[PDB]
Design a binder for this molecule. Structure first.
Ligand SMILES: O=P(O)(O)O[C@H]1[C@H](O)[C@@H](OP(=O)(O)O)[C@H](OP(=O)(O)O)[C@@H](OP(=O)(O)O)[C@H]1O
Ligand SMILES: O=P(O)(O)O[C@H]1[C@H](O)[C@@H](OP(=O)(O)O)[C@H](OP(=O)(O)O)[C@@H](OP(=O)(O)O)[C@H]1O
Ligand SMILES: O=P(O)(O)O[C@H]1[C@H](O)[C@@H](OP(=O)(O)O)[C@H](OP(=O)(O)O)[C@@H](OP(=O)(O)O)[C@H]1O
Ligand SMILES: O=P(O)(O)O[C@H]1[C@H](O)[C@@H](OP(=O)(O)O)[C@H](OP(=O)(O)O)[C@@H](OP(=O)(O)O)[C@H]1O
Ligand SMILES: [Zn+2]
Ligand SMILES: [Zn+2]
Ligand SMILES: [Zn+2]
Ligand SMILES: [Zn+2]
Lengths: 163, 163, 162, 162
């Protein structure tokens, strides 16, 4: 369909599979009313590459900011003070797109960008059937969730954000 | 003025003073357009007692839920399954009323109640001049904030909740 | 034994002592089978304070409603649920009668009454002295306006059959 | 030395070799005082890849705009800021001329050009051979349509004074 948005972010490994590393990839993310998908980016040629995953827009229970990790390495750190480059190498503002399998973590290089996305994603998911009301505002890491130490990657959020 | 709300909650020590313990008190909380105030409760006689603090409604930068502590003792635990009593002895749903001096933490015995309050408090603070946009969704405890480990009790929130 | 109930009613002075004035105290009531007890409530620590009374279930003769008195002071004026009202307003005055006489416990709400009474019955039900005429009326100012008669333990101007 | 700039322009083949076809590569340009260099960009690791060229600043004779060619293929078609467009669209073709000849670097945006050029000048400014007639025109298909003349390093059909 149409592309609502398209940006380059740094996403963390969903680690769907056991043997998978916890790592980050620069990916070109798209968004249609249908899905949220991400592809390898072919910078040389300038084009989207091989698809590396999607999440169907309707299976989405929730989308929000995530509490930034405490000691992020520079690729996701906030500087002090050339953007065109930085905006494709430094992604410090994460957010979370949660669904049945768990949460996909996505870092954005600017806030506005993150804002932009969360919002559309919101619009997009407004009438979904499973919009959860409790989420985890912290990352899932090393076996469990910081915020509540629960271990089920798709555990119930330990917090209700209600207006 | 009018009372918008009145409930009994279990509040944690603001510890404004150095020599102060980190502890909880059952307090009768009120809310007018002017302030948010809390008093000792005189249960025998059934009346509000001596005032023990307020926070001026306009100095309020923010109000939200807080991520529940991981191992709360029973007075703030969620049961399994007589309410009239429980609702004055068990307060497991906290929330945070933040202002210049820091955050006041307030536990509510039910969610609806917490809902109710956060909302009015919201209305009440809608046109305030300092409504912060970043908060700490976790408690301040033992010297710093869990969510971001910052130590300034009135540190900048490490998270932006934007719709 | 094992509690069977537990609530916070208001209760008028039993006046057992000649000195005793009449007044109401907010108390925390329990229920087992053996007895039915009330304490001072540690609102602050949120817990049961000093025992202030007991009535053995066995000596219970008549668990029953009483008659919402005429002009309940606020306190007692008009299951219901105000976190605070419900521990500050008990307009459903009931009555437990026993050897010594009748205990006047008040309720913030009906389901609450029901709940107790009923339960009361479950527990006295096999007693040895379930009287069958009673004073749905109060005992007051010197005498039961049930039957203007005067012995607290005066016999009941009314009968409740079934 | 100390970078003075750093960007990602597109750049047409210098064709130094007879084999060399003409094409454009996305490259990462730096700037110091000594030289001006371009590399392959490690987009994935987000970093500077293999060096693909250098031009000594000193041998710089003429830093200057060139002439937006006729029918820029998308790629080059129409400071500006699309996270992606700005690293995918460089329509502001400029030119660095030196001994060997002229290097055709393209820009996604004007402030970006300006920024470089200017800076360029700061750095060649005291050179020993700042020529003063140039070919705002391209060198193409066999010959500079600046002056239809043919030596790459052909002398400039135009002068830029000040
Ligand atoms: O490239 P290597 O070093 O194998 O590691 C990968 C990447 O992080 C993947 O991201 P992408 O898919 O973006 O390549 C991730 O997939 P997701 O994070 O998309 O799931 C894979 O996890 P699994 O989820 O275990 O497949 C993980 O194995
Ligand atoms: O009763 P003790 O054992 O002294 O401890 C108190 C109570 O927690 C107070 O609550 P309340 O005011 O509700 O009594 C608290 O005030 P706040 O939490 O209101 O500030 C005091 O902290 P300071 O903030 O340090 O005064 C703390 O000293
Ligand atoms: O506290 P003060 O003002 O002294 O009055 C007391 C309380 O009403 C007692 O209730 P509680 O025990 O619930 O405090 C009542 O006991 P009962 O429990 O027998 O009513 C006392 O009378 P006596 O009944 O006379 O002891 C009465 O004097
Ligand atoms: O990669 P392929 O298709 O082989 O083509 C190359 C690139 O355009 C070179 O650019 P880069 O070095 O930027 O890759 C260019 O070098 P210049 O940098 O001299 O343009 C080469 O020509 P020569 O100029 O003939 O070497 C040209 O053949
Ligand atoms: Zn959690
Ligand atoms: Zn924080
Ligand atoms: Zn009678
Ligand atoms: Zn020319």
């Amino acid at each position: 369909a149409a592309v609502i948005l398209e940006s380059i972010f740094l996403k963390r490994s969903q680690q769907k599979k056991k043997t998978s590393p916890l790592n980050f990839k620069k990916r070109l993310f798209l968004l249609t009313v249908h899905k949220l998908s991400y592809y390898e980016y072919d910078f040389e040629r300038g084009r989207r590459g091989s698809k590396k995953g999607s999440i169907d827009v309707e299976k989405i229970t929730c989308v929000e900011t995530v509490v930034p990790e405490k000691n992020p390495p520079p690729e996701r750190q906030i500087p002090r003070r050339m953007e065109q480059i930085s905006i494709i190498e430094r992604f410090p503002y994460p957010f979370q797109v949660v669904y049945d399998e768990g949460p996909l973590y996505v870092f954005s290089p600017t806030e506005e960008l993150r804002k932009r996305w969360i919002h559309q994603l919101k619009n997009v998911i407004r009438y979904n059937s499973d919009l959860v009301q409790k989420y985890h505002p912290c990352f899932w890491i090393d076996g469990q969730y910081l915020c509540c130490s629960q271990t089920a990657k798709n555990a119930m959020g330990c917090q209700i954000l209600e207006n």
